[PDB]
Design a protein around this ligand. Structure first.
Ligand SMILES: *C/C=C(C)/C=C/C=C(C)/C=C/C1=C(C)CCCC1(C)C
Ligand SMILES: *C/C=C(C)/C=C/C=C(C)/C=C/C1=C(C)CCCC1(C)C
Ligand SMILES: *C/C=C(C)/C=C/C=C(C)/C=C/C1=C(C)CCCC1(C)C
Ligand SMILES: *C/C=C(C)/C=C/C=C(C)/C=C/C1=C(C)CCCC1(C)C
Ligand SMILES: *C/C=C(C)/C=C/C=C(C)/C=C/C1=C(C)CCCC1(C)C
Ligand SMILES: CCCCCCCCCCCCCCCCCCCC
Ligand SMILES: CCCCCCCCCCCCCCCCCCCC
Ligand SMILES: CCCCCCCCCCCCCCCCCCCC
Ligand SMILES: CCCCCCCCCCCCCCCCCCCC
Ligand SMILES: CCCCCCCCCCCCCCCCCCCC
Ligand SMILES: CCCCCCCCCCCCCCCCCCCC
Ligand SMILES: CCCCCCCCCCCCCCCCCCCC
Ligand SMILES: CCCCCCCCCCCCCCCCCCCC
Ligand SMILES: CCCCCCCCCCCCCCCCCCCC
Ligand SMILES: CCCCCCCCCCCCCCCCCCCC
Ligand SMILES: CCCCCCCCCCCCCCCCCCCC
Ligand SMILES: CCCCCCCCCCCCCCCCCCCC
Ligand SMILES: CCCCCCCCCCCCCCCCCCCC
Ligand SMILES: CCCCCCCCCCCCCCCCCCCC
Ligand SMILES: CCCCCCCCCCCCCCCCCCCC
Ligand SMILES: CCCCCCCCCCCCCCCCCCCC
Ligand SMILES: CCCCCCCCCCCCCCCCCCCC
Ligand SMILES: CCCCCCCCCCCCCCCCCCCC
Ligand SMILES: CCCCCCCCCCCCCCCCCCCC
Ligand SMILES: CCCCCCCCCCCCCCCCCCCC
Ligand code: NA
Ligand code: NA
Ligand code: NA
Ligand code: NA
Ligand code: NA
Lengths: 273, 273, 273, 273, 269
């Protein structure tokens, strides 16, 4: 049938269908997703006053991101269950058109919140040295936006037009690398002046940042990571994608936020850990 | 098909239908909408005590507006997905009558909250000089109400009666210009007596106000901005409208509120931003 | 069609149906309704500590009422959209039986919360002189209950039995007049001892009270206010009713609560307006 | 129709059906139910600091109970509307199987929270004299549990097996009487040492306790209180049941909690009424 | 019918169906489940400042766990969606359009709960010989593996008894390790502290041991009376969800309460 510019999940769901395990796991992992976010929201709110006032905006922004992430992940969980329906006769879940096609694009647009805020918030914990606050912020926000928008466009074509898929992806990747560049600079400048304990944490933050953010373009490519008609162009690929997103989200948002708060505590004059 | 006094989205949806991208993007952008608002709610609550007590009503009113905006944008997101349903055979989303017709009128009525409050709240940060508090407030609230109500009437006719559409629109525009007038006065009087830092922020606030508020009549006209049977009288026009609304909403509510809070901080005796 | 003891909305919906504007406006105005209430909830919570401790129960009760009002108005909004469904062929919304008949009775029973609390709460701001606190409270609560319950019974018969409609209404009206009586007494005793500023506010409160509360029996009668087979026995009447309710609710609950809080501030030794 | 071990509501709904008034009132009263609970939640949270720290657990437990009650009453409201559907032809609501059968059992199991907590909480306001805290608590909790569980079993048979109905009921009643016994003891010991104002309140609390708690076994029996084929074995009986539950719930939870808080205030060294 | 790798609830629901009592009780007990969790959330938040600042992370983590609400709520809805009344025979049968019922929701949400529940005690007790990071890491790794292996197993609880039991066994191994470490922790926690505190830690260990053990009980539940036994039936379905609910309340709420009580005794102010 005629699906057009639609994510590959829909093509699997429309042809092969999803096994119990495939469908259920995807449902489960998305649910875990939004559960983590709302739990995180509570954590970040409840820990605000555990750091000096100047650092507390970081906590607040963590919270802001959690709200966004919860809402989107919740929506997406529902979208998954609405989009695919059990067929008694063969014992598989198939595309149910009246539920809408499943799209990952929900995620992408909500990054327009998450990415800017996640990048922003570290600038409230670390002091810069050579770099200007406004400069770093602006470069983060611009590169962040362009990364997301270009990617957002790409992913519509992940089946219908492999070329546009890869080209927009490439453009997106460029802006990604810039963000990586700037974050490294920031982290290095942040290390200057501060205790070895704080430096250790920033080291961890950078590792976490690097891995977790890289997962996202991984999820982009996931269906094609074993070439055409590979292992991953299948329900297994579908599962892998949503797993990676969920891991990425938890890491890039919650764990990131926790580490930052820990850093804030070491840099806090009153407070110990 | 007989649609009557209904928004043009429904006419597109009933005849041509919406592509995957058109339907999905509109869904996505509305979702981002309400997500931003709930995130904002948390921000404004959590930052109340970042300014002197006298300023804190501004924070509170920001929060009040966020609640309104969230609820409306959430409803509207749902209305969009209910109103248009996938057709397997042609691969487009078509008007589903049993979901109700899509109307933008939800937005308009909720402005009866937002507009009065957004105008009101600045009067808790800036001091007036030559203008009287109650006078400015009353002119804001009256002109605000009339602007919205006249617009609300107009938009019902955006297809069924181009003339009424444009006339009510024109009347609405008059009240808009008055509001612009008064806000300018307010901004200028607010600048007097206060630090250059604060003056800079009020300058930004005015620009933001001017652009963001102007977008709304833009969205009004959107379908017709390329004349009859133009580019924009189409799913592309539908997309444009909801994008512009979302940008307008984020700008006019969240960013506006942030800047005001920043101003409040500079004007705060204790706090040194 | 066999509807029985049902509100007149259902008879309109079942015979003539509702135009786009009629259906949509009613939907919109009910939505505004509950949006205002949740916004109000936030306001009243966030402003508690803006008055002396002794006054703060008034804020708390405002909040309590908002919760009630939100829940009910939300339910009612949903009930409206569920009860009436678009017919493609004629382009009007008709009674959809599977959604339940629309009833205003939801509102009535929730007044069993709102009315007692709204009457109660003023007694925490004003001092009485000659009257006893418990006496005024008991008279409010008894008369309030009887007013609502008798009205609640009446409105079931607003179509099926004009006689019972008017008789129960009349009985209800009696208790209403008593409440008006007592509130006047309270307002007068409240004015004694206190600044001209406070007296002004109580004057406004009384006007607001008188008008807003009177709207409710107006809504009761609405369908018949232009006699049999009049303008108002129609979708226009339906619209009028729900508009009036929404205006009444906002006025009698939110604005009322705001004014009371303003009064509390003037009567607060520490706090200024 | 084959209904089995089902509540009598379903038998009425399946045979006679429910009139507009019967269906609507039941819907309305259940809605009022959960509305009161959520309002109560807000009240109890907002008033925590109105008593000395030692008393504040009582407030907290009130809040705990409200959350439980809200959730259950909300669910139950939805269950009612899902279980019974309008039939255009005769103008009555009939059992809709696809909505599930209506069961009161939701209520019963949620008492496993409410009852233990309601009994517990008074022990944080009153001082015992002869009786030990842990002893009273344990007897409350055991007797409470057994009361509920035995009742829960009974009510499944309220139609299918009048004998089991009455026997399990009887067993339940035994545990009830014990609870009554212990609460009386507690109330009497609580009166010793404390002001006449406090004693008055505890007297009221005992009356409230006795009446409100007794309503619950009343609701149990309701359908049969006028014998076989009586007034009450009918939609009128259905209405009566849910009314009584709602009155019982408001009384046993909210009003009870309010009185306790009032008592706490009199017993507070810092605070006056 | 063709159900595949699906939980046994679905096989009961598809063949025999569920009586009013079976269906309703399961609905009721799951509802109680999530109600308790939301109530608990409020309790733990409202009691944070009842202990010294250093202990307050334990309260916060209790709150975080009260995850449980969201999952139990979802699961309640899943139950009612998955099984629909048949008027003709008066039983509830599998309704395919609602999805098959899976317990897997629970399992994956443990990936939150278990790590946090294990973690949080380390904010109340002082260790002696053991290192904080060491205990944490062993908890978190063993916790994850326990859940993941179990999660895989339960898919096969009907379709493949062998895989069911094998993955279960592997899971059990990691469980025993967690038990081991928790015991160590409890013992080290007792050292140096008041008799009041020691008493509470004793209770905590008992509660931990019983409540956590219930979970593998629920795993096996359908087969605890052998093939075609009492429990391979709607009665078994009921038993499972009851045990989960008891386990959840115990392992989360009561656990959290006791910990807070311990925190209070150890509090100087
Ligand atoms: C909390 C959400 C976060 C941190 C999202 C991050 C998203 C990215 C780093 C996306 C990167 C992409 C590319 C670099 C290429 C493909 C398109 C994107 C947007 C997925
Ligand atoms: C947060 C919402 C805001 C700030 C809404 C603002 C809305 C307007 C400025 C609407 C203006 C209009 C005209 C000036 C002409 C067409 C009708 C309106 C109401 C869209
Ligand atoms: C917040 C809700 C309020 C203040 C509701 C007030 C309701 C009334 C004053 C109702 C009055 C009525 C009559 C006096 C006659 C008709 C029946 C009633 C109940 C609508
Ligand atoms: C907030 C809920 C409360 C206070 C519930 C109280 C419930 C009872 C006192 C139930 C009593 C029963 C009997 C004594 C006999 C019939 C079975 C019961 C459980 C309804
Ligand atoms: C709050 C949730 C908790 C404490 C969950 C605990 C879960 C377990 C201890 C699960 C244990 C299992 C086995 C040891 C064997 C079968 C598979 C599991 C995961 C159910
Ligand atoms: C229905 C589920 C609700 C999720 C809870 C959302 C968390 C927001 C509330 C946290 C507020 C914490 C207040 C701190 C008080 C400290 C004592
Ligand atoms: C969609 C592109 C991302 C832009 C993020 C917008 C965030 C709005 C807040 C801006 C307010 C200015 C902050 C002043 C810096 C101190
Ligand atoms: C199939 C060949 C590709 C045609 C469209 C490519 C679009 C690339 C956008 C840059
Ligand atoms: C098409 C490549 C876009 C350039 C990426 C580098 C970003 C520059 C921002 C400074
Ligand atoms: C699946 C395993 C669960 C891991 C839980 C991750 C939670 C984030 C922890 C951040 C590390 C903080 C360490 C500080 C110790 C004091
Ligand atoms: C010192 C200035 C701090 C500004 C913090 C801004 C936080 C605002 C949170 C609102 C939600 C995110 C807005 C992003 C909009 C992107 C579309
Ligand atoms: C379900 C999503 C809930 C998001 C709503 C946010 C509610 C605001 C809570 C504010 C808590 C303030 C406490 C401040 C403590 C420092
Ligand atoms: C300090 C001034 C006194 C406060 C008055 C309280 C009124 C608050 C309610 C806001 C009303 C906004 C006006 C909107 C008009 C809608 C008419 C239709
Ligand atoms: C001076 C009171 C408000 C004036 C209205 C501005 C012009 C209205 C246009 C019609
Ligand atoms: C159409 C009704 C619009 C009102 C919606 C607002 C709901 C929240 C209440 C806002 C209160 C205004 C604040 C007035 C402050 C007065 C001085 C203190
Ligand atoms: C200064 C901190 C005071 C915290 C008060 C927060 C109260 C928030 C409750 C209102 C609910 C907002 C709507 C949430 C949408 C879901
Ligand atoms: C005190 C009693 C209330 C008096 C109000 C008038 C009662 C009308 C009764 C109708 C018969
Ligand atoms: C100091 C005494 C104040 C008592 C106010 C009680 C407020 C309880 C709020 C719940 C609403 C109850 C309505 C029952 C009908
Ligand atoms: C002193 C300020 C403390 C703030 C307490 C806020 C309590 C929130 C209670 C939750 C109920 C919110 C209503 C539900 C909205 C949907
Ligand atoms: C069915 C009985 C319900 C009991 C409520 C469970 C509450 C757990 C409390 C643990 C014991 C704490 C002892 C301190 C007093
Ligand atoms: C204690 C057990 C009570 C069960 C009695 C059931 C009697 C059934 C007779 C028909
Ligand atoms: C019909 C309205 C019933 C309202 C119930 C509210 C219960 C409060 C009773 C306590 C009275 C306190 C008196 C002032 C302190
Ligand atoms: C059926 C089990 C019900 C358990 C209670 C549910 C509510 C959770 C809140 C816990 C409150 C217990 C506090 C005890 C205080 C000890 C000091
Ligand atoms: C819509 C129903 C939501 C139920 C509300 C439960 C939320 C619990 C969190 C409230 C936090 C209150 C903290 C206030 C501290 C004083
Ligand atoms: C996959 C599981 C993820 C768990 C999500 C729960 C979110 C809560 C975050 C846990 C916080 C860990 C506490 C860090 C301790 C450091 C503080 C020392 C002072
Ligand atoms: Na599905
Ligand atoms: Na749709
Ligand atoms: Na509708
Ligand atoms: Na119904
Ligand atoms: Na069902």
């Amino acid at each position: 049938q005629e699906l057009g510019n639609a994510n590959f999940e829909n093509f699997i769901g429309a042809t092969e269908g999803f096994s119990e395990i495939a469908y259920q796991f995807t449902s489960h992992i998305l649910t875990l997703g939004y559960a983590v976010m709302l739990a995180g929201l509570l954590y970040f709110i409840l820990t605000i006053k555990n750091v000096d006032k100047k650092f507390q905006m970081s906590n607040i922004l963590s919270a802001v991101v959690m709200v966004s992430a919860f809402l989107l992940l919740y929506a997406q969980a529902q979208n998954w269950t609405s989009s695919f329906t059990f067929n008694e006769e063969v014992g598989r879940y198939f595309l149910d058109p009246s539920g809408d096609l499943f799209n990952n694009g929900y995620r992408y647009l909500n990054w327009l919140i998450d990415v800017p805020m996640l990048l922003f918030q570290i600038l409230f914990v670390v002091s810069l040295t050579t770099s200007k606050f406004s400069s770093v912020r602006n470069q983060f926000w611009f590169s962040g936006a362009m990364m997301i928008i270009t990617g957002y466009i790409g992913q519509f074509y992940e089946v219908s037009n492999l070329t546009a898929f890869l080209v927009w992806g490439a453009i997106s990747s460029a802006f990604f690398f810039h963000i990586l560049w700037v974050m490294k600079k920031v982290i290095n400048e942040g290390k200057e002046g501060i205790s070895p304990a704080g430096q250790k944490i920033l080291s961890n933050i950078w590792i976490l940042f690097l891995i977790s953010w890289t997962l996202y373009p991984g999820a982009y490519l996931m269906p094609y990571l074993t070439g055409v008609d590979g292992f991953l162009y299948s329900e297994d690929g579908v599962m892998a994608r949503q797993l990676v997103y969920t891991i990425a989200d938890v890491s890039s948002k919650v764990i990131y936020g926790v580490l930052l708060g820990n850093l804030a505590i070491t840099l806090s004059k009153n407070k110990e850990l």
